[PDB]
CSV table of C-alpha atoms and ligand atoms in Angstrom, one decimal:
chain,number,residue,atom,x,y,z
A,1,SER,CA,0.0,0.0,0.0
A,2,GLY,CA,2.8,2.4,1.0
A,3,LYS,CA,4.7,0.7,-1.8
A,4,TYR,CA,2.0,1.4,-4.2
A,5,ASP,CA,1.7,5.0,-3.2
A,6,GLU,CA,5.5,5.7,-3.3
A,7,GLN,CA,5.7,4.1,-6.8
A,8,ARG,CA,2.8,6.3,-8.0
A,9,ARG,CA,4.7,9.3,-6.8
A,10,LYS,CA,7.5,8.3,-9.2
A,11,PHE,CA,5.3,8.4,-12.3
A,12,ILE,CA,3.5,11.6,-11.2
A,13,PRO,CA,5.8,14.6,-11.2
A,14,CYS,CA,3.1,16.9,-9.7
A,15,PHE,CA,1.8,14.4,-7.1
A,16,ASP,CA,1.4,16.8,-4.2
A,17,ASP,CA,-0.5,19.5,-6.0
A,18,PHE,CA,-2.4,17.1,-8.3
A,19,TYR,CA,-4.0,15.3,-5.3
A,20,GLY,CA,-3.8,18.3,-3.0
A,21,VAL,CA,-5.8,20.5,-5.4
A,22,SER,CA,-8.4,17.7,-6.0
A,23,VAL,CA,-9.0,17.5,-2.2
A,24,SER,CA,-9.0,21.3,-1.7
A,25,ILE,CA,-11.9,21.8,-4.2
A,26,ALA,CA,-13.8,18.8,-2.9
A,27,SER,CA,-16.2,20.8,-0.7
A,28,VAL,CA,-19.9,20.1,-0.4
A,29,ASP,CA,-22.5,21.3,2.1
A,30,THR,CA,-22.5,18.1,4.1
A,31,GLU,CA,-19.8,16.8,6.5
A,32,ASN,CA,-21.3,13.3,5.7
A,33,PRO,CA,-21.1,13.2,1.9
A,34,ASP,CA,-21.6,10.1,-0.1
A,35,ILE,CA,-18.6,9.8,-2.4
A,36,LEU,CA,-18.3,7.7,-5.5
A,37,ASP,CA,-14.7,7.0,-6.5
A,38,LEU,CA,-14.5,5.8,-10.1
A,39,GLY,CA,-11.4,3.5,-10.9
A,40,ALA,CA,-10.4,3.8,-7.3
A,41,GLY,CA,-7.5,1.5,-7.6
A,42,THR,CA,-5.8,1.0,-4.3
A,43,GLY,CA,-8.0,3.8,-2.9
A,44,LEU,CA,-5.4,6.6,-2.7
A,45,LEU,CA,-7.7,9.4,-3.9
A,46,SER,CA,-10.4,8.2,-1.4
A,47,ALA,CA,-7.8,8.2,1.4
A,48,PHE,CA,-6.8,11.9,0.8
A,49,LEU,CA,-10.5,12.8,0.7
A,50,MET,CA,-11.1,10.8,3.9
A,51,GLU,CA,-8.6,13.1,5.7
A,52,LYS,CA,-10.9,16.0,4.8
A,53,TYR,CA,-14.2,14.2,5.5
A,54,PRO,CA,-13.6,11.4,8.1
A,55,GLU,CA,-17.4,10.8,8.3
A,56,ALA,CA,-18.0,10.5,4.6
A,57,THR,CA,-19.3,7.4,2.9
A,58,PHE,CA,-17.1,6.0,0.0
A,59,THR,CA,-18.0,3.7,-2.8
A,60,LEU,CA,-14.9,2.5,-4.6
A,61,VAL,CA,-15.3,1.0,-8.1
A,62,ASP,CA,-12.7,-0.9,-10.0
A,63,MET,CA,-12.3,-3.8,-12.3
A,64,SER,CA,-9.4,-5.0,-10.3
A,65,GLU,CA,-10.2,-7.2,-7.2
A,66,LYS,CA,-6.5,-7.1,-6.4
A,67,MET,CA,-6.5,-3.2,-6.2
A,68,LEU,CA,-9.7,-3.2,-4.2
A,69,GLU,CA,-8.2,-5.8,-1.8
A,70,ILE,CA,-5.4,-3.3,-1.1
A,71,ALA,CA,-8.0,-0.6,-0.6
A,72,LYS,CA,-9.9,-2.8,1.9
A,73,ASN,CA,-6.7,-3.2,3.9
A,74,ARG,CA,-5.9,0.4,3.7
A,75,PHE,CA,-9.4,1.1,5.1
A,76,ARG,CA,-9.5,-1.8,7.6
A,77,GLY,CA,-12.4,-1.8,9.9
A,78,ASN,CA,-13.9,1.4,8.3
A,79,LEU,CA,-17.6,0.4,7.9
A,80,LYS,CA,-18.4,3.4,5.8
A,81,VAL,CA,-16.5,2.1,2.7
A,82,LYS,CA,-18.2,-0.1,0.1
A,83,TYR,CA,-16.3,-1.9,-2.7
A,84,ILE,CA,-17.6,-2.8,-6.2
A,85,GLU,CA,-15.7,-4.9,-8.7
A,86,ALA,CA,-17.1,-3.7,-12.0
A,87,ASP,CA,-16.5,-1.6,-15.1
A,88,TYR,CA,-17.7,1.8,-14.0
A,89,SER,CA,-18.4,2.6,-17.7
A,90,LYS,CA,-21.0,-0.1,-17.8
A,91,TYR,CA,-22.3,-0.1,-14.2
A,92,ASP,CA,-25.9,0.9,-13.5
A,93,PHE,CA,-25.5,3.2,-10.5
A,94,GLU,CA,-28.8,3.5,-8.6
A,95,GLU,CA,-27.7,5.6,-5.6
A,96,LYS,CA,-27.2,9.4,-5.6
A,97,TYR,CA,-24.0,11.0,-4.5
A,98,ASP,CA,-22.6,14.3,-3.3
A,99,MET,CA,-19.4,13.8,-5.2
A,100,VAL,CA,-18.3,11.8,-8.2
A,101,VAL,CA,-14.5,11.8,-8.2
A,102,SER,CA,-11.8,10.0,-10.2
A,103,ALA,CA,-8.0,10.0,-10.6
A,104,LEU,CA,-6.0,8.7,-13.6
A,105,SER,CA,-8.7,6.3,-14.9
A,106,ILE,CA,-11.2,8.0,-17.3
A,107,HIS,CA,-8.4,8.4,-20.0
A,108,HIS,CA,-8.6,4.6,-20.6
A,109,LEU,CA,-12.2,4.8,-22.0
A,110,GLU,CA,-13.2,5.2,-25.6
A,111,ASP,CA,-14.1,8.8,-26.3
A,112,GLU,CA,-17.8,7.9,-26.6
A,113,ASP,CA,-17.7,6.2,-23.3
A,114,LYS,CA,-16.0,9.3,-21.7
A,115,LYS,CA,-18.7,11.6,-23.1
A,116,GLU,CA,-21.5,9.3,-21.8
A,117,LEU,CA,-19.8,8.9,-18.4
A,118,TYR,CA,-19.7,12.7,-18.0
A,119,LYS,CA,-23.3,12.8,-18.9
A,120,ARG,CA,-24.3,9.9,-16.6
A,121,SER,CA,-22.3,11.5,-13.7
A,122,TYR,CA,-24.5,14.6,-13.7
A,123,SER,CA,-27.6,12.4,-13.3
A,124,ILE,CA,-26.4,10.4,-10.4
A,125,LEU,CA,-25.3,13.4,-8.3
A,126,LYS,CA,-27.8,14.5,-5.7
A,127,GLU,CA,-29.8,17.5,-6.6
A,128,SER,CA,-26.6,19.2,-5.4
A,129,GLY,CA,-23.0,17.9,-5.9
A,130,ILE,CA,-19.6,18.1,-7.6
A,131,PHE,CA,-17.6,16.1,-10.2
A,132,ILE,CA,-13.7,16.0,-10.0
A,133,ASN,CA,-11.6,14.2,-12.6
A,134,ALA,CA,-7.8,14.4,-12.0
A,135,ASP,CA,-6.7,12.8,-15.2
A,136,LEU,CA,-4.2,12.7,-18.1
A,137,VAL,CA,-5.0,15.0,-21.0
A,138,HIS,CA,-3.7,14.9,-24.6
A,139,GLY,CA,-1.7,17.8,-26.1
A,140,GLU,CA,-3.7,20.3,-28.1
A,141,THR,CA,-1.4,19.7,-31.1
A,142,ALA,CA,1.2,17.1,-31.9
A,143,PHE,CA,4.0,19.5,-30.9
A,144,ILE,CA,2.3,20.1,-27.5
A,145,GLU,CA,1.8,16.3,-27.0
A,146,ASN,CA,5.5,15.8,-27.7
A,147,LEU,CA,6.4,18.6,-25.3
A,148,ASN,CA,4.3,17.1,-22.6
A,149,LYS,CA,5.6,13.6,-23.1
A,150,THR,CA,9.3,14.7,-23.4
A,151,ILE,CA,9.1,16.5,-20.0
A,152,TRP,CA,7.3,13.6,-18.4
A,153,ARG,CA,9.8,11.0,-19.7
A,154,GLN,CA,12.6,13.2,-18.3
A,155,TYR,CA,11.0,13.1,-14.9
A,156,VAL,CA,10.3,9.3,-15.0
A,157,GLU,CA,13.8,8.4,-16.2
A,158,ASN,CA,15.2,10.4,-13.4
A,159,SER,CA,12.8,9.4,-10.6
A,160,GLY,CA,15.0,6.7,-9.2
A,161,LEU,CA,13.3,3.8,-10.9
A,162,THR,CA,15.2,1.1,-12.7
A,163,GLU,CA,15.4,0.7,-16.5
A,164,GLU,CA,12.9,-2.2,-16.2
A,165,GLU,CA,10.5,-0.2,-14.0
A,166,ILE,CA,10.7,2.7,-16.4
A,167,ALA,CA,10.1,0.6,-19.5
A,168,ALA,CA,7.2,-1.3,-17.8
A,169,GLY,CA,5.4,1.9,-17.0
A,170,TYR,CA,5.9,3.0,-20.6
A,171,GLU,CA,4.3,-0.3,-21.7
A,172,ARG,CA,1.3,0.4,-19.4
A,173,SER,CA,0.8,3.8,-21.0
A,174,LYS,CA,0.3,2.3,-24.5
A,175,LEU,CA,-3.5,1.6,-23.7
A,176,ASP,CA,-4.1,5.4,-23.0
A,177,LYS,CA,-6.9,7.0,-24.9
A,178,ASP,CA,-6.3,10.5,-23.5
A,179,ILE,CA,-8.0,13.5,-25.3
A,180,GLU,CA,-7.7,17.3,-25.2
A,181,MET,CA,-8.6,19.0,-21.9
A,182,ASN,CA,-10.9,21.6,-23.4
A,183,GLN,CA,-13.0,19.0,-25.2
A,184,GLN,CA,-13.6,17.3,-21.9
A,185,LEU,CA,-14.6,20.6,-20.2
A,186,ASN,CA,-17.1,21.1,-23.1
A,187,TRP,CA,-18.6,17.6,-22.4
A,188,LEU,CA,-19.1,18.5,-18.8
A,189,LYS,CA,-20.8,21.8,-19.7
A,190,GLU,CA,-22.9,19.9,-22.3
A,191,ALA,CA,-23.9,17.5,-19.5
A,192,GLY,CA,-25.4,20.4,-17.4
A,193,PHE,CA,-22.4,21.0,-15.1
A,194,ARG,CA,-21.8,24.7,-14.1
A,195,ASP,CA,-18.6,26.4,-12.7
A,196,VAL,CA,-16.8,24.1,-15.1
A,197,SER,CA,-13.0,24.7,-14.8
A,198,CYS,CA,-9.5,23.3,-15.1
A,199,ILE,CA,-8.2,24.1,-11.5
A,200,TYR,CA,-4.8,22.6,-11.9
A,201,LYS,CA,-2.7,21.7,-14.9
A,202,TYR,CA,0.9,20.4,-15.2
A,203,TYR,CA,1.7,19.4,-18.8
A,204,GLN,CA,-0.6,16.3,-19.3
A,205,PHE,CA,-1.9,16.2,-15.8
A,206,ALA,CA,-5.1,18.2,-15.2
A,207,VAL,CA,-7.7,18.5,-12.4
A,208,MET,CA,-11.1,19.3,-14.0
A,209,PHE,CA,-14.1,20.3,-11.9
A,210,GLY,CA,-17.8,20.8,-12.4
A,211,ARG,CA,-20.7,21.6,-10.1
A,212,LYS,CA,-24.4,20.5,-10.2
A,213,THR,CA,-26.5,23.3,-8.7
B,1,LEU,CA,22.7,27.7,-7.3
B,2,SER,CA,23.1,29.2,-10.8
B,3,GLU,CA,25.6,27.5,-13.1
B,4,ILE,CA,26.4,30.8,-14.9
B,5,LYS,CA,28.3,33.9,-14.0
B,6,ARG,CA,26.0,36.2,-11.8
B,7,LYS,CA,26.9,39.4,-9.9
B,8,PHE,CA,25.4,39.3,-6.4
B,9,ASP,CA,22.8,42.0,-5.9
B,10,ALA,CA,21.1,42.5,-2.5
B,11,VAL,CA,18.2,44.6,-3.6
B,12,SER,CA,17.0,42.3,-6.4
B,13,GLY,CA,17.4,39.3,-4.1
B,14,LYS,CA,15.0,40.9,-1.6
B,15,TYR,CA,12.4,41.6,-4.3
B,16,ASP,CA,12.7,37.9,-5.4
B,17,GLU,CA,12.0,36.7,-1.9
B,18,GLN,CA,8.9,38.8,-1.5
B,19,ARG,CA,7.5,37.7,-4.9
B,20,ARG,CA,7.9,34.1,-3.8
B,21,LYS,CA,5.8,35.0,-0.8
B,22,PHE,CA,2.9,36.3,-3.0
B,23,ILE,CA,3.0,33.3,-5.4
B,24,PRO,CA,2.0,30.0,-4.0
B,25,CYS,CA,3.1,28.0,-7.0
B,26,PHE,CA,6.4,30.0,-7.5
B,27,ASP,CA,8.8,27.2,-8.5
B,28,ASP,CA,6.5,25.6,-11.0
B,29,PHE,CA,5.1,28.9,-12.3
B,30,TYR,CA,8.6,30.1,-13.2
B,31,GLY,CA,10.0,26.5,-13.7
B,32,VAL,CA,7.5,25.7,-16.4
B,33,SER,CA,7.9,29.0,-18.2
B,34,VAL,CA,11.7,28.2,-18.5
B,35,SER,CA,11.1,24.5,-19.6
B,36,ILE,CA,9.0,25.5,-22.5
B,37,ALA,CA,11.3,28.3,-23.6
B,38,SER,CA,13.3,26.3,-26.0
B,39,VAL,CA,14.6,27.5,-29.3
B,40,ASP,CA,17.5,26.1,-31.4
B,41,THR,CA,20.2,28.9,-31.0
B,42,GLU,CA,22.2,29.2,-27.8
B,43,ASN,CA,22.2,33.0,-28.2
B,44,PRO,CA,18.4,33.7,-28.6
B,45,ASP,CA,17.1,37.3,-28.8
B,46,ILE,CA,14.6,37.5,-25.9
B,47,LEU,CA,12.0,40.3,-25.2
B,48,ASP,CA,10.8,40.6,-21.6
B,49,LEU,CA,7.5,42.6,-21.6
B,50,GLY,CA,6.7,44.3,-18.2
B,51,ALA,CA,10.0,43.0,-17.0
B,52,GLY,CA,10.0,44.6,-13.5
B,53,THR,CA,13.2,43.7,-11.6
B,54,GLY,CA,14.2,41.2,-14.3
B,55,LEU,CA,13.3,38.0,-12.5
B,56,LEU,CA,11.8,36.1,-15.5
B,57,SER,CA,14.9,37.1,-17.6
B,58,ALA,CA,17.2,35.9,-14.8
B,59,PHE,CA,15.5,32.5,-14.8
B,60,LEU,CA,15.8,32.4,-18.6
B,61,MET,CA,19.5,33.4,-18.5
B,62,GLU,CA,20.2,30.2,-16.5
B,63,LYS,CA,19.2,28.2,-19.5
B,64,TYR,CA,20.6,30.7,-22.0
B,65,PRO,CA,23.6,32.5,-20.4
B,66,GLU,CA,24.6,34.0,-23.9
B,67,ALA,CA,21.1,35.2,-24.9
B,68,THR,CA,20.5,38.8,-25.6
B,69,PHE,CA,17.7,40.3,-23.3
B,70,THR,CA,15.6,43.4,-23.8
B,71,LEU,CA,13.6,44.4,-20.6
B,72,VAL,CA,10.7,46.7,-21.1
B,73,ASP,CA,8.9,48.4,-18.2
B,74,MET,CA,7.2,51.7,-17.4
B,75,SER,CA,9.1,51.8,-14.1
B,76,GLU,CA,12.6,53.3,-14.1
B,77,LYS,CA,12.9,52.2,-10.6
B,78,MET,CA,12.2,48.6,-11.5
B,79,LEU,CA,14.5,48.8,-14.5
B,80,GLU,CA,17.4,50.2,-12.3
B,81,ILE,CA,17.0,47.2,-10.0
B,82,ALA,CA,17.3,44.9,-13.1
B,83,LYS,CA,20.5,46.8,-14.3
B,84,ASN,CA,22.1,46.1,-10.9
B,85,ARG,CA,20.8,42.5,-11.0
B,86,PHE,CA,22.6,42.0,-14.3
B,87,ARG,CA,25.6,44.2,-13.5
B,88,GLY,CA,28.3,43.6,-16.0
B,89,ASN,CA,26.4,41.4,-18.5
B,90,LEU,CA,26.7,43.3,-21.7
B,91,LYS,CA,23.8,41.7,-23.5
B,92,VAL,CA,20.8,43.2,-21.7
B,93,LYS,CA,19.0,46.3,-23.1
B,94,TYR,CA,16.5,48.3,-20.9
B,95,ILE,CA,13.7,50.3,-22.3
B,96,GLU,CA,11.3,52.5,-20.3
B,97,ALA,CA,8.1,52.5,-22.1
B,98,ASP,CA,4.6,51.1,-22.1
B,99,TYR,CA,5.4,47.8,-23.9
B,100,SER,CA,1.8,47.8,-25.0
B,101,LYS,CA,2.3,50.9,-27.3
B,102,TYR,CA,6.0,50.7,-28.1
B,103,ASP,CA,7.1,50.3,-31.8
B,104,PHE,CA,9.3,47.2,-31.7
B,105,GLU,CA,11.6,47.1,-34.8
B,106,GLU,CA,13.8,44.1,-34.1
B,107,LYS,CA,12.8,40.4,-34.2
B,108,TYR,CA,13.0,38.1,-31.3
B,109,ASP,CA,13.3,34.3,-30.7
B,110,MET,CA,11.0,34.7,-27.6
B,111,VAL,CA,8.4,37.3,-26.3
B,112,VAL,CA,7.9,36.4,-22.7
B,113,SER,CA,6.1,38.1,-19.8
B,114,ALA,CA,5.3,37.3,-16.1
B,115,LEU,CA,2.4,38.9,-14.2
B,116,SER,CA,2.0,42.0,-16.2
B,117,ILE,CA,-0.4,41.7,-19.1
B,118,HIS,CA,-3.4,41.3,-16.8
B,119,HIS,CA,-3.0,45.0,-16.0
B,120,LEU,CA,-3.9,46.0,-19.6
B,121,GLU,CA,-7.4,46.8,-20.9
B,122,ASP,CA,-8.8,44.0,-22.9
B,123,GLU,CA,-8.4,45.7,-26.3
B,124,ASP,CA,-4.8,46.3,-25.5
B,125,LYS,CA,-4.3,42.6,-24.5
B,126,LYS,CA,-5.9,41.6,-27.8
B,127,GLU,CA,-3.6,44.0,-29.7
B,128,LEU,CA,-0.5,43.1,-27.8
B,129,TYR,CA,-1.0,39.4,-28.9
B,130,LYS,CA,-1.4,40.4,-32.5
B,131,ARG,CA,1.8,42.5,-32.4
B,132,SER,CA,3.9,40.0,-30.4
B,133,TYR,CA,3.2,37.7,-33.4
B,134,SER,CA,4.6,40.3,-35.8
B,135,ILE,CA,8.0,40.7,-34.0
B,136,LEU,CA,8.8,37.1,-33.5
B,137,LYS,CA,11.3,35.1,-35.7
B,138,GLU,CA,10.1,31.9,-37.4
B,139,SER,CA,9.6,29.1,-34.8
B,140,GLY,CA,9.7,31.9,-32.2
B,141,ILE,CA,7.7,31.5,-29.1
B,142,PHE,CA,5.3,33.5,-26.9
B,143,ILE,CA,5.1,32.8,-23.2
B,144,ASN,CA,2.8,34.6,-20.7
B,145,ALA,CA,2.9,33.5,-17.2
B,146,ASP,CA,0.0,35.5,-15.8
B,147,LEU,CA,-3.1,35.8,-13.5
B,148,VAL,CA,-6.4,34.6,-15.1
B,149,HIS,CA,-9.9,35.3,-13.9
B,150,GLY,CA,-12.1,32.5,-12.6
B,151,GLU,CA,-14.6,31.1,-15.2
B,152,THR,CA,-17.5,32.0,-12.9
B,153,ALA,CA,-18.1,33.9,-9.7
B,154,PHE,CA,-17.9,30.7,-7.8
B,155,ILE,CA,-14.5,29.7,-9.3
B,156,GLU,CA,-13.2,33.3,-8.9
B,157,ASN,CA,-14.0,33.1,-5.2
B,158,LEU,CA,-12.4,29.6,-4.9
B,159,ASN,CA,-9.1,31.0,-6.6
B,160,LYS,CA,-9.1,34.1,-4.3
B,161,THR,CA,-9.8,32.3,-1.1
B,162,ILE,CA,-6.9,29.8,-1.8
B,163,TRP,CA,-4.6,32.6,-2.6
B,164,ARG,CA,-5.5,34.7,0.5
B,165,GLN,CA,-4.9,31.7,2.7
B,166,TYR,CA,-1.4,31.2,1.4
B,167,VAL,CA,-0.6,34.9,1.6
B,168,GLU,CA,-1.7,35.2,5.2
B,169,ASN,CA,0.6,32.3,6.1
B,170,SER,CA,3.7,33.0,4.0
B,171,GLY,CA,5.6,35.6,6.2
B,172,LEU,CA,4.5,38.8,4.5
B,173,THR,CA,3.9,41.8,6.8
B,174,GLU,CA,0.4,43.1,7.2
B,175,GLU,CA,1.6,46.0,5.2
B,176,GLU,CA,2.9,44.1,2.3
B,177,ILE,CA,-0.3,42.0,2.4
B,178,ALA,CA,-2.4,45.1,2.1
B,179,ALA,CA,0.0,46.8,-0.3
B,180,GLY,CA,-1.2,44.0,-2.6
B,181,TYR,CA,-4.9,43.7,-1.9
B,182,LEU,CA,-5.4,47.4,-10.7
B,183,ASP,CA,-6.3,44.0,-12.1
B,184,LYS,CA,-8.0,43.6,-15.4
B,185,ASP,CA,-7.6,39.8,-15.4
B,186,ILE,CA,-9.8,37.8,-17.7
B,187,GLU,CA,-10.5,34.1,-18.1
B,188,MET,CA,-7.9,31.9,-19.6
B,189,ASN,CA,-9.8,30.6,-22.7
B,190,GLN,CA,-10.5,34.1,-24.0
B,191,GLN,CA,-6.7,34.7,-23.9
B,192,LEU,CA,-5.9,31.4,-25.6
B,193,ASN,CA,-8.4,32.4,-28.3
B,194,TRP,CA,-6.8,35.8,-28.7
B,195,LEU,CA,-3.4,34.1,-29.3
B,196,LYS,CA,-5.0,31.8,-31.9
B,197,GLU,CA,-6.6,34.9,-33.6
B,198,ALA,CA,-3.2,36.6,-33.8
B,199,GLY,CA,-1.9,33.6,-35.8
B,200,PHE,CA,-0.1,31.6,-33.1
B,201,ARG,CA,-0.1,27.8,-33.3
B,202,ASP,CA,0.3,25.1,-30.7
B,203,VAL,CA,-1.5,27.4,-28.3
B,204,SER,CA,-1.9,25.8,-25.0
B,205,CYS,CA,-2.2,26.3,-21.3
B,206,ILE,CA,0.9,24.4,-20.0
B,207,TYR,CA,0.5,25.1,-16.4
B,208,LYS,CA,-2.3,26.3,-14.1
B,209,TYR,CA,-2.7,26.6,-10.4
B,210,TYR,CA,-6.0,28.3,-9.6
B,211,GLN,CA,-5.6,31.9,-10.9
B,212,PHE,CA,-2.0,31.5,-12.1
B,213,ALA,CA,-1.5,30.1,-15.6
B,214,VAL,CA,1.4,29.7,-18.0
B,215,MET,CA,0.2,30.2,-21.6
B,216,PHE,CA,2.2,29.3,-24.7
B,217,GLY,CA,2.0,29.9,-28.4
B,218,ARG,CA,4.4,29.5,-31.3
B,219,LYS,CA,4.9,31.2,-34.7
B,220,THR,CA,5.4,28.7,-37.5
C,301,CA,CA1,-13.9,-10.9,-10.8
C,302,CA,CA1,10.5,58.3,-17.2
């Protein structure tokens, strides 16, 4: 768990602000919010959010039972956490939430799935709530994509990781279907979200926010 | 520690420390502007618009110690601090003028600016972008590291509140803090659009941290 967090820090050159900004803007008018964490993985984003809202309810969704198993141990004995092994793109959510949040997961969906997930997220928020996606975004042109990737590879190659850990992470990134940030902000606006904004951006890493009011 | 020949200068150092106390994302704000400032020559011609005490230029000289710099500012006092910052260095020019109205005749590899353009009226912003395009060399780049307005009242309040928090805990005197609480800031997309309108390509927001954004465009 610690080992999974410390490794993640080595692929994410803006780790502290990336997760710190996502937590800072995650404010709702309940100190007991119901939070849905899409592609929760080992539950790192939900953990940062639990520091801010210790009495929140969390629903972690992930295809990986293994990741979720790490999350359950991370959250040992916390009865306010629910775990669902499923593809959150396909899952029929029937509860309503104060927050729908995600880190580094939505860029793996086909573009049509992204668009529809943004749309569906609006409908499963309570009559009030927020959406936060801290995710990878594609360069606006091929030159900007190359710029973003060059800087990120420089960081990864110098993060302390071995040649084989570097190459393995590069292999994992071949399934990415990232798209331009602005196109994703447009899909949130088109879904009905207001106060739509990119709050944080560091080359390909962006924290995107919307509010249902 | 710079890896180039600098002359120590007490005054410009003190101004640098205070700016870091007003800017919560200081390292990355300036760090990113320098990462993206890449052109082929090792002696680029760089224009610094609203250069102040020369801080953005000094960061850029780390990466390009033999570049030629032209600092433009309405303030002679700011510019004098810059001259003493770059004491000796023979390749810095200083011009006291409103960079938004001055007739630039040379061409540059880079037009850069930090925290200054948001003080211009919108029509002057729009027009500065058009004209910066004109005075750039082929493959030249435009960088503006600046304040942007929140997209809505709610996001504006979020940005301000975060900043005010930092600023009350960063070590600034209650004077300095109030000596800072002028702005015609506007939303980021509108500025990106204005760069595209002036002819820039590869227009992108490279970095953003609430109201602080580093915007980029290139002439090709
Ligand atoms: Ca299974
Ligand atoms: Ca004068």
